[PDB]
Design a protein around this ligand. Structure first.
Ligand SMILES: C=C1[C@H](O)CC(=C/C=C2\CCC[C@]3(C)[C@@H]([C@H](C)[C@H](CCCC)CCC(C)(C)O)CC[C@@H]23)C[C@H]1O
Lengths: 240, 11
């Protein structure tokens, strides 16, 4: 059953997620406004959304027990490689299968396939991301499971350029054993059915969405006209 | 190569 250290990890991750994820979406009013008629009329708004989301993921990451005790260089490698994947994960909280959209509280901040295509992304790559969101939504994760999964995603010891892979793996294993034990102790059947295995498969799916995005980003931003519509932080994190 | 902003958000 769940130890005090495993309960403590969870408590920490919940607190971290709560302070970095406003389920009212009030800050979106400060983004460049959405335009749904440039042709990339949604790129300013969704670039802001991403950049805001990178900030938040970094605030969550810094709270993961042991992350701040890694070297700065390894912290930076882990965040650069995982940032899009944790954006994808955390977005699941607004995603709704009613319409296959991300519903952030109002018609202006509801994002569908079309909106994302007006940010420069092919329907072919957008489709796998919607399918991912559906599969993840179907898991019906407890908040505890959601946050642990975001954390396991960030402290992955296989990301290219990691120097202290063992230290990263020691963290991740503590999160992972916390997750397994939580599903077994607190998640009732049958929702718990192979739930750990399914969650870990989502991380593998996210590697694929990452790789595909990486190439598309490299194309979009290679164009100075598009890069100019991004933010400083997005350029720094995803590259120039 | 440098990550001034990401560094600052980690500090
Ligand atoms: C606060 C929130 C989350 O942080 C983010 C969120 C929604 C996330 C979305 C909806 C719009 C399109 C987003 C931003 C996707 C984004 C445009 C990416 C490309 C930018 C990555 C740096 C799509 C890439 C594909 C999948 C098309 O290859 C990923 C997550 C998507 C709203 C809310 O839940």
């Amino acid at each position: 059953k769940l130890s005090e250290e495993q309960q403590h990890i969870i408590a920490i991750l919940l607190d971290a997620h709560h302070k970095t994820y406003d389920p009212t979406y009030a800050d979106f009013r400060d983004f460049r406004p959405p335009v749904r008629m440039s042709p990339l009329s949604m790129l300013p708004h969704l670039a802001d959304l991403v950049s805001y989301s990178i900030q938040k993921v970094i605030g969550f990451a810094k709270m993961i027990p042991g992350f701040r005790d890694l070297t700065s260089d390894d912290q930076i490698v882990l965040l650069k490689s995982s940032a899009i994947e944790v954006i994808m994960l955390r977005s699941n909280q607004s995603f709704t299968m009613d319409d296959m959209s991300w519903d952030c509280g109002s018609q202006d901040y509801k994002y569908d396939v079309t909106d994302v295509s007006k940010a420069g992304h092919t329907l072919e790559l957008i489709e796998p991301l919607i399918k991912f969101q559906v599969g993840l939504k179907k898991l019906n994760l407890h908040e505890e499971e959601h946050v642990l999964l975001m954390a396991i995603c960030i402290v992955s010891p296989d990301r290219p350029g990691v120097q202290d892979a063992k230290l990263v793996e020691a963290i991740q294993d503590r999160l992972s054993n916390t997750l397994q034990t939580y599903i077994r102790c607190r998640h009732p059947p049958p929702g718990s059915h192979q739930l750990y295995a399914k969650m870990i498969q989502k991380l593998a799916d996210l590697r694929s969405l990452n790789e595909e995005h990486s190439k598309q980003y490299r194309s979009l931003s290679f164009q100075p006209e598009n890069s100019m519509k991004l933010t400083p932080l997005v350029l720094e994190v995803f590259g120039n | 190569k440098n990550h001034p902003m990401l560094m600052n958000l980690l500090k």
